[PDB]
Amino acid sequence: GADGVGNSSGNWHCDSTWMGDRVITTSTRTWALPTYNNHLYKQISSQSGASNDNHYFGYSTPWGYFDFNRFHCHFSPRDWQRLINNNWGFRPKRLNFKLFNIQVKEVTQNDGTTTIANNLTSTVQVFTDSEYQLPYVLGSAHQGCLPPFPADVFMVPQYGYLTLNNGSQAVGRSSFYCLEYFPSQMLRTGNNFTFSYTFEDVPFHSSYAHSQSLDRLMNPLIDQYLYYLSRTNTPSGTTTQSRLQFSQAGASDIRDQSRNWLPGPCYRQQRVSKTSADNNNSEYSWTGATKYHLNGRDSLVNPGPAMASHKDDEEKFFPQSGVLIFGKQGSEKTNVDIEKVMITDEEEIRTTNPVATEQYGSVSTNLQRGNRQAATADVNTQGVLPGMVWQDRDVYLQGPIWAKIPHTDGHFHPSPLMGGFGLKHPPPQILIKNTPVPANPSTTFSAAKFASFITQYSTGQVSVEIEWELQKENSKRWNPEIQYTSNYNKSVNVDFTVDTNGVYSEPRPIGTRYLTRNL
Amino acid sequence: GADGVGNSSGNWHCDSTWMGDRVITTSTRTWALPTYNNHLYKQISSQSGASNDNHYFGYSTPWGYFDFNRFHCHFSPRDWQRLINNNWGFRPKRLNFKLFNIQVKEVTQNDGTTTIANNLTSTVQVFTDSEYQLPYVLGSAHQGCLPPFPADVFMVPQYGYLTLNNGSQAVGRSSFYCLEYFPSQMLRTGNNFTFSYTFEDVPFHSSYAHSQSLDRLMNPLIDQYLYYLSRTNTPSGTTTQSRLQFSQAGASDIRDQSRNWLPGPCYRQQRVSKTSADNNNSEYSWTGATKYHLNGRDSLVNPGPAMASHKDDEEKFFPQSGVLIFGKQGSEKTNVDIEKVMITDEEEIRTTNPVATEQYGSVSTNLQRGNRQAATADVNTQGVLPGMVWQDRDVYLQGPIWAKIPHTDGHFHPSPLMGGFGLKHPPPQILIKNTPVPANPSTTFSAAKFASFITQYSTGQVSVEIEWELQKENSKRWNPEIQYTSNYNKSVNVDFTVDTNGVYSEPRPIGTRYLTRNL
Amino acid sequence: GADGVGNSSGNWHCDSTWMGDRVITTSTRTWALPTYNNHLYKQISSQSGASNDNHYFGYSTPWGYFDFNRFHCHFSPRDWQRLINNNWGFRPKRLNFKLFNIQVKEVTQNDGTTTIANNLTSTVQVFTDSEYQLPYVLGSAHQGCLPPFPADVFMVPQYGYLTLNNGSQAVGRSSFYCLEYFPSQMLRTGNNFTFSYTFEDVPFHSSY
């Protein structure tokens, strides 16, 4: 699209409509973009000394990108609630994007006095990496997505990436991608950039919780017909004499019943409690946390494989890195106290996946014989096994929406671990930069790189609309399901509202599983 | 096909052409075939005493088979190089085979003097087991495939197979397949045997190395928004008092960052070093090597599941059985010294799969509490887990090309472990035998089995052409990729050449990953 | 072309005719071919010490080649004379080649006594490097072309070539061409191999 200077390049679309089966969440926000790295690509690396587990090598670019991989960039409390309360599941189908009403300003810091003014002509160029030839950054839970609250103006993030490294230094194989080596489209004012995408058949996120659970799944009333090993030894006057007898598992017997499927896999996490007291006093934050390691650098295992966060009656506990944790609007960056964060809870799964903090089961160790007692041992890490079945990490309104499946020789069940939809070809990276403006050059020629540009930034609005599909409920469940509600009682502030000084804020994390489906 | 005696049953096709997307490697070689087991099927078994882990039972047949399950039976250094240097990947599509110019000779060892002459009439019969009713031997890394070097004449291997066994003895279930119970086609001279095959949709072998790696994958510039557990206890005058605080992972924080996928699986191997010194002195060749075991016989775990062979800066090490090892042209059969072999290296993977010699990660053991320190333990064997992603063993010019997927109730990701393409219905076994020639029978009848045949063997050439598909490169990588080159400096002998006495020889193993794709 | 065992795969053409403007010199000769390097490619180099101006590195092949880059393989004194006496100049235009009546024998040196006999089946394979992917040896004034005199039987030369070298040793850039990496056509007896060529506009040799 194209037009004039006194012509709005696009209108403001920010609705949300439900169609019974679909529902489209349109949404627009105003943004701003500075000139990063003063227009140059800069090489960047870990700090020489820095622990090995923390080295790196890569580049930062003068390019800034766009991102809305956060559910709340599309759903509004209320809306989300609608969804989350009457749908067995849902998934994204297609999207449409558009930047417009772009405007380029140029600040002038003459002595003690700045003065911003329109640089009409100068441009901002955009380009979408629709061929995925660029290090996909999104999906890395970074923060600089869209504001949950419309009215909020925002700054565009700067693109940076990482290649290979042998400590703080580069290794040859590492590649250096240059963003100008693409065909950016250049916008001036009166210019807009639209583009549209279509998702790929993915599974509806399961937005329901299970009423039955693996173990308790058969019918009480009837005993099976298969037998199991009831007792081993037997009374012989005073002493026992080994004599194995078997029984037919019934209701009273349950624990012993024969089955057909196994809980999901696991990778044991340390348990910490919301109650300061209980927790051993010391620094096992890193030392005790569950991790894995590549090329000799141990990394953390955050968002551990999807597994319930606490047994019955222990909402007080949680994994050291088995859950998602968001900050309460305002919460500072580092070492903030428990009271400043919102920890997610995944009890809803208990029913199928193991509890993060407790071992999977316990396999037998030795082979018993008359002169040898029967061994056994608990298992803290069980990789996928036939017959296992499980549930993936719920979603949360202010959580990630999707993530790119890495291009590898092999993947195994790609639901992104941080939760979300695992996409092979996700929404392409959208980039934006401000074509430089060489400030006054010298009369006599010089072949040096230009270094003195006009100080200036850009701004303008952006809009994103997405169509989601739904799987409606359908249970013959007689008694009421659970629903997500807002507290009745009076409060000094409404949830998901602007305070007295107009600061919007999300009180709690809102999950997705409320409706109840049987297993 | 058919014709006369003074008529070449086929010409010599040994080209190789590239078409941009495909590339066909035609190739012909001269061969020779003796008469095995003096024409009879012989029962064969382990040596009574022999360690249990080494028993067996099966048969050897008078039949010899054909095989080219080695990349170099089709690619010529140069060619291979072309491929390997400009292609994100490739795979086989179809093939065509033909035997021809068959000729049957008959030696005469009259006293101190042999004398070979043409037995025109007598025949050689061939037959392809296109229904896979015969124990698929190929794929077992046996040696008797085609000569890498054209000019080389070769001997055809003899077919043998193995069934069940209870120690050195047979067990009933074990089957005994007889090769005459097939409809062999009989060739006399002037007769040729052609046949063609078509591969099945398989995945292009990934012939590229990764520039990013699982851990270092997100964007440096921006800190995430999810929080993790920074510290546990806290300064209380003199003493620490447990007080968990959380942080928001950033660049400096990296190791702690939240992610979305896990390294490939693992099965720990012992580390040995190319440097004699380091290595503990003793015999842990078997005792210390990683293995598995069926029906009480521990077998070795060679070509362990695909996993990088050494961390940064340790090209000197390697798994005890985690790598492929070829002999330097000439190297004898047993206990040959390190200097006689070429060990393959799979560093290229590091980026996704674990290091063979070092544990996967480390899970937590106990549950900590005030009166209990936080436990933890390293894991040396991790079975596939959701979110895991990885790369398969590279290929190597003189490596296997494919392998038959065993007919079972269940397989899991069939890329053959020794590397190659996992095929459900691979190129059918091709067999060949020389119809016997009863040497002079007695005038008076006898119903005994004939035992005195004419001494004779066969020869003639064979040709195999195969069409491979390619996936061309396509990265916006600015700086040069790595390529495979031959050393500039002078040398007494060219690599992949015949020495002074015309002995062709492959200097080093050549992999496949050189081109660099991002993860 | 193809046929049987008791069938001459080609006749003997050895004429020479003048047409006023053209003149065609046909010519046939009998030849023989041993098995070189006992069937293998052998690496070959100057003699370590040997003056520098005389070092080299290259290979010898089990392959033998054909050659008639000598005017007398086509002209007969007399003929040549005709030409040479009444022509301001001349040049070649096209050619046609054919091998035939191929026969494979096999000697038997049993003790103090050899005995040659027909190995009917066995073959001889031929192939023309029509894409010039092989080190062009001919033109190097080598000797093993055709006999000037028809009646003369001859032996076929063996193919060998030279690459780069840093003294008596090889240098990487040097290439090693393998003759089997071509699609040889295989002849058995009763088999013939013909092929034809066409020269390119060249200047008449000034014969005045």
Decide: A464 and A27 in contact? Cβ < 8 Å: yes
Is the pair A, B in contact (3+ CB pairs within 8 Å)?
A: yes
Q: Distance between CA atoms of B231 and B240, rounded to whole angstroms? A: 12
* Cβ pair B147, B29 in contact under 8 A: yes
- CA of B49 vs chain A CAs: smallest distance (Å): 27
With 0-12 CB in 10 A as exposed, 13-18 as middle and 19+ as buried, what is B44?
middle
Contact C121 B491 (CB under 8 A): no
Eight-state DSSP code of residue B80: H
Residue with the two structure tokens 């010089």: A446
Q: Which residues contact C61 (CB under 8 A, 6 or more apart)?
A: C36, C37, C41, C158, C159, C160, C161, C179
Q: Which residues pair with B458 in a beta bridge?
A: B33, B104
Partners of residue A159 in chain B, C-beta under 8 Å: 219, 221
Task: Measure B164 CA to nearest chain A CA, in Å.
Answer: 26
Residue C79's φ and ψ, nearest 5 degrees, are -45, -65
Rounded to a whole number of angstroms, the distance from the CA of B460 to the nearest CA of chain A is: 41
Residue B82 is inside which H or E element, if any? Answer: helix B77-85
Check if the beta carbon of residue B391 is closer than 8 Å to that of residue B263: no
* DSSP notation for B403-433: EEPP--S--S----TTSSEEESSPSPPEEEE
* 3-state SS assignment for residue C17: strand
How many Cα atoms sit within 13 Å of B252 on the Cβ side?
7
Q: Taking CB atoms and an 8 Å limit, are A160 and B220 in contact across chains?
A: yes
For residue B236, give every residue at least 6 positions away whose Cβ sits within 8 Å of its Cβ, in sequence order, or none.
none
Q: Phi and psi (nearest 5°) for A30?
A: -85, 140
Task: Tell me if B373 and A280 make a contact (CB, 8 A cut-off).
Answer: yes
- Phi, psi for A38 (deg, rounded to 5): 40, 40
Q: Does B14 touch chain C (CB under 8 A)?
A: yes
**Distance between CA atoms of residues B343 and B325, nearest Å:** 4
- Least Cα distance to A397 among A444, A349, A342, A357 occurs for A342
Half-sphere exposure at residue B419, Cβ-oriented, CA atoms within 13 angstroms:
28
What is the rounded distance in angstroms from the CA atom of residue A269 to the CA atom of residue A319?
Answer: 5
Which residues in chain B have Cβ-Cβ distances shorter than 8 Å to A406? Answer: 214, 261, 389, 519
Q: Name the DSSP letter for residue A226.
A: S
Q: Using alpha carbons only, how large is chain B's radius of gyration in Å?
A: 29
> Quick check: B364 and A412 CB within 8 A?
no
CA–CA separation, A390 and A262 (whole Å): 9
- In terms of Cα–Cα distance, which of A161, A324, A403, A323 is closest to B387? A403
Which residues of B are less than 8 Å from C112 in CB distance?
none
The CA-atom distances, in angstroms, between A514 and each of A219, A309, A343, A518, C109 are 25, 17, 18, 13, 96
A141–B388 CB contact, under 8 Å? no
User: Chain B within 8 Å of A283 (Cβ-Cβ)?
Assistant: yes
Handedness of CA A126, A128, A129, A135 (dihedral sign): positive
| Gap between the Cα atoms of B428 and B198, Å rounded | 11
B85, containing H or E segment = helix B77-85
Amino acid at B447: A
- Determine the Cα–Cα distance for residues A87 and A474; give it in Å rounded to an integer: 9
Question: Inter-chain contact C120–B10, Cβ cutoff 8 Å?
Answer: no
C123 vs B contacts (CB less than 8 Å) = 8, 101
- Nearest Cα to Cα of residue C161 among C47, C45, C25: C45
Distance to chain B for A110, nearest Cα, Å: 31
- For residue A9, report the phi and psi dihedrals to the nearest 5 degrees: -60, -5
| Rounded distance between C-alpha atoms, residue B510 and residue B518, angstroms | 22
In this structure, the number of other CB atoms found within 10 A of the CB of residue A71 comes to 23
Is residue B46 within 8 Å of residue B171, measured between CB atoms? Answer: no
CA atoms within 13 A on the CB side of B390: 26
Q: Is B356 near chain A, with CB under 8 Å?
A: no
Listed in sequence order, the residues at least 6 apart from A139 whose beta carbon sits closer than 8 Å to its beta carbon are: A69, A400, A402, A403, A404, A416, A420, A426, B260
Element (H, E) at A101: strand A87-106
The one-letter code for the residue type at B281 is N
C 61-120 near B (Cβ less than 8 A): 62, 108, 110-111, 119-120
- Partner-chain contact A321 B206, CB within 8 Å: no
Residues in chain B, total: 519
Alpha-carbon distance of C162 to C184, in angstroms, equals 22
Resolution in A: 8.5
Amino acid letter, residue B352:
T
The span from the CA of A69 to the CA of A421, in Å, is 11
A181 in contact with B at a CB cutoff of 8 Å? yes
Determine the Cα–Cα distance for residues A45 and A167; give it in Å rounded to an integer: 9
The residues facing B318 across adjacent strands are B272
Length of chain A: 519
Q: Could you tell me if A359 lies within 8 Å of chain B, comparing CB atoms?
A: no
CB-nearest to C172 from B15, B189, B488 is B488
The answer to whether residues C104 and B5 touch, using CB atoms and an 8 Å cutoff, is: no
Q: Where are the alpha helices (DSSP H) in A46-149?
A: 77-85
Q: Which amino acid appears at position C12 of this protein?
A: W
A50–chain B Cβ distance below 8 A for any pair: yes
**B28 three-state secondary structure:** strand
Quick check: A281 and B312 CB within 8 A?
no
For B150, name the nearest residue in chain C, comparing CA atoms only.
C180
Nearest CA in chain B to A52: B255
Beta carbons of B392 and A407 less than 8 Å apart: no
- Test C181 with B14 for CB contact under 8 angstroms: yes
Interchain contact, B498 vs C166, CB within 8 Å:
no
**Contact residues, B window 308-327, toward C, CB-based 8 Å cutoff:** none
Give how far the C-alpha of residue A282 lies from the chain's centroid of Cα atoms, to the nearest Å: 30
Q: Which of residues 459-498 of B touch A (CB under 8 A)?
A: 474-479, 482
Identify each DSSP E strand in B46-86 by its residue range. 57-66
* Alpha carbon distances (Å) from A245 to A227, A242, A257, B182: 10, 10, 16, 54
Question: β-strands A515-517, A208-210: how paired?
Answer: parallel
Using DSSP, state whether B122 is helix, strand or coil.
coil
B518 shares contact with chain A (CB less than 8 Å):
yes
CB A421, CB A401: distance < 8 Å: yes
The amino acid present at B470, given as its one-letter code, is L
Considering only the beta carbons, identify the residue of B6, B13, B487 that sits closest to C189: B6
Amino acid at A481: E
Is residue B237 left, alpha or beta, with left meaning phi > 0 and alpha meaning psi from -120 to 50? left
Distances (CA, A) of B148 to A380, B32, B71, B79: 50, 17, 8, 12
Any chains having at least 3 CB pairs less than 8 A from chain A are B
Tell me the shortest Cα–Cα distance from C187 to chain B, in angstroms. Answer: 6
What domains are defined for chain B?
A: 1-519 (2.170.30.10)
Report CA-CA distances (Å) from C136 to A385, C174, C198: 65, 15, 18
Write the CB contacts of B82 (distance below 8 Å, at least 6 apart in sequence): B18
Interchain contact, C178 vs B487, CB within 8 Å: no
**What is the C-alpha to C-alpha distance for residues A246 and A223, in angstroms, rounded to an integer?**
14
> If we measure between CA atoms, which residue out of A345, A222, A383, C111 comes closest to residue B267?
A383
> Do residue A414 and residue B256 have CB atoms under 8 angstroms apart?
no
What end-to-end distance do the CA atoms of chain A give, in Å?
51
Q: How deeply is B480 buried, as exposed, middle or buried, from its count of CB atoms within 10 A (0-12, 13-18, 19+)?
A: exposed
d(CA A144, CA A67): 7
The Cα–Cα gap between A211 and A519 comes to: 7
Interface contacts (B, C; CB < 8 Å): 127
Q: How do beta strands B227-236 and B239-248 pair?
A: antiparallel
Structure tokens given for A230: 């009831």
Could you tell me which residues come within 8 angstroms of residue B387 by beta carbon, excluding any fewer than 6 positions away?
A305, A412, A413, A414, A415, A416, A417, B260, B261, B262
Q: Is B169 helix (H, G, I), strand (E, B) or coil?
A: strand
* Residue ranges of E strands in B199-313: 205-206, 208-210, 227-236, 239-248, 266-267, 271-273, 291-294, 297-300
Q: What is the C-alpha to C-alpha distance for residues B130 and B430, in angstroms, rounded to an integer?
A: 8
Distance CA A48, CA A58 (A): 14
User: What are the distances in angstroms from CA B393 to CA B229, B348, B436, B484, C68?
Assistant: 37, 10, 44, 18, 54
Are residues B490 and C163 in contact, defined by beta-carbon separation less than 8 angstroms? no
Technique used = cryo-EM
What is the nearest CA distance from C98 to chain B, expressed in angstroms?
17
SS3 labels along B1-54 = CCCCCCCCCCCCCCCEEECCCEEEECCEEEEEECCHHHHCCEEEECCCCCCHHH
Q: How far is B256 from chain A (nearest CA, A)?
A: 5
Write the DSSP assignment of C19-84 as a string of letters: -SS-EEE-----EE---GGGG--EEEE--TTS-GGG--EEEEEEEE-----SGGGT--HHHHHHHH
